[PDB]
Amino acid sequence: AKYTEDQLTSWTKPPSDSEQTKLENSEKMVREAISSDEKLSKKTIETFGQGSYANNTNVRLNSDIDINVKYSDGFYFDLPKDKSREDFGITLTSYSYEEYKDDVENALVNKFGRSEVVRKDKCITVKENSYRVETDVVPTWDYRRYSENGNYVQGTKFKTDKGIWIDNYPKQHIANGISKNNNTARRFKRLTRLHRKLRYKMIDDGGNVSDNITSFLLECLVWNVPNRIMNDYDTWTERLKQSIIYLYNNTREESSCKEWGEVSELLYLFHGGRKWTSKDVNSYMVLLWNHLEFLEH
Ligand SMILES: O=c1ccn([C@@H]2O[C@H](COP(=O)(O)OP(=O)(O)OP(=O)(O)O)[C@@H](O)[C@H]2O)c(=O)[nH]1
Numbered sequence: 287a288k289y290t291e292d293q294l295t296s297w298t299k300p301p302s303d304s305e306q307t308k309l310e311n312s313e314k315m316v317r318e319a320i321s322s323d324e325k326l327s328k329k330t331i332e333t334f335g336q337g338s339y340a341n342n343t344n345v346r347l348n349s350d351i352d353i354n355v356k357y358s359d360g361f362y363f364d365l366p367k368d369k370s371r372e373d374f375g376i377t378l379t380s381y382s383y384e385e386y387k388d389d390v391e392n393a394l395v396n397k398f399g400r401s402e403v404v405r406k407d408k409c410i411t412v413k414e415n416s417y418r419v420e421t422d423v424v425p426t427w428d429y430r431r432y433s434e435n436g437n438y439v440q441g442t443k444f445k446t447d448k449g450i451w452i453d454n455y456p457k458q459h460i461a462n463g464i465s466k467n468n469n470t471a472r473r474f475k476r477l478t479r480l481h482r483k484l485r486y487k488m489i490d491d492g493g494n495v496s497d498n499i500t501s502f503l504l505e506c507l508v509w510n511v512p513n514r515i516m517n518d519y520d521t522w523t524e525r526l527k528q529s530i531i532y533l534y535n536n537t538r539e540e541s542s543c544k545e546w547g548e549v550s551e552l553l554y555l556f557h558g559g560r561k562w563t564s565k566d567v568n569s570y571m572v573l574l575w576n577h578l579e580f581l582e583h
Pocket residue numbers: 336337338339344349350352453454455456459501502505
């Protein structure tokens with residue numbers, strides 16, 4: 287074992303006792319930037335956390351906090367092929383996502399100053415000082431995806447500066463992660479923290495980790511590890527070993543994992559459009575296993 291049980295147990299832990307405080311401070315500052323803007327305050331816009339601080343899975347002290355700002359006065363939607371869009375109800379509006387993101391960047395500059403705000407491809411970064419963590423503000427619009435039965439699932443949708451349209455389901459993501467954490471006696475998110483920290487260590491001491499293995503991907507993988515592997519073992523060394531074994535085994539053939547979804551369970555994990563592959567995950571599991579140096583016979 288390249289690492290001891292104490293070290294792994296320590297790395298299953300939040301990087302500060304004030305994580306929720308930082309998240310709520312970022313949420314409040316973004317919400318105030320919204321509410322004290324002349325243009326946006328007159329629009330239905332919900333400010334809420336997403337990502338590692340909202341899932342209590344962050345492992346890097348004062349890493350970026352993700353704050354979604356979701357416009358909901360008009361929603362994008364997607365219908366099955368056997369349904370008409372006209373029959374559902376159409377709405378035309380002079381407002382667009384591009385103008386919304388420009389407005390959000392304007393409000394952020396107004397509240398925090400242009401030198402503190404940095405527009406990026408998928409977000410708008412507010413720089414960290416001594417009182418606030420660096421915050422990625424993510425402007426999105428309401429999004430509905432309808433199924434055959436008439437029910438819809440609700441989420442967020444946005445357009446990158448490079449013109450790519452992205453759909454997300456952050457609320458269902460957080461809800462499902464909370465459910466699994468409850469049903470694992472709070473071991474799911476500890477194992478997620480351990481995996482994230484291990485990825486960072488491997489990248490730091492020189493290891494060759496693929497850029498396709500993201501933190502969101504690691505979280506979705508640990509999400510896909512069945513609860514029994516977390517519940518039915520007694521040390522973190524063994525839970526980690528078994529989770530790696532499971533992910534490796536079920537990523538050797540695309541058939542074993544082509545049905546896995548992300549934490550929201552509303553999008554597939556390996557159905558194209560992703561920057562990773564199941565072979566990428568399998569290679570990463572091999573690299574991590576060889577890094578950990580478990581005892582063998
Ligand atoms: O590919 C993606 C990436 C991101 N997202 C959505 O954007 C949220 C934050 O996107 P992040 O890339 O920041 O993931 P993370 O916060 O969990 O890990 P860090 O790198 O920040 O440490 C994610 O929680 C997810 O809801 C997706 O839906 N798909």
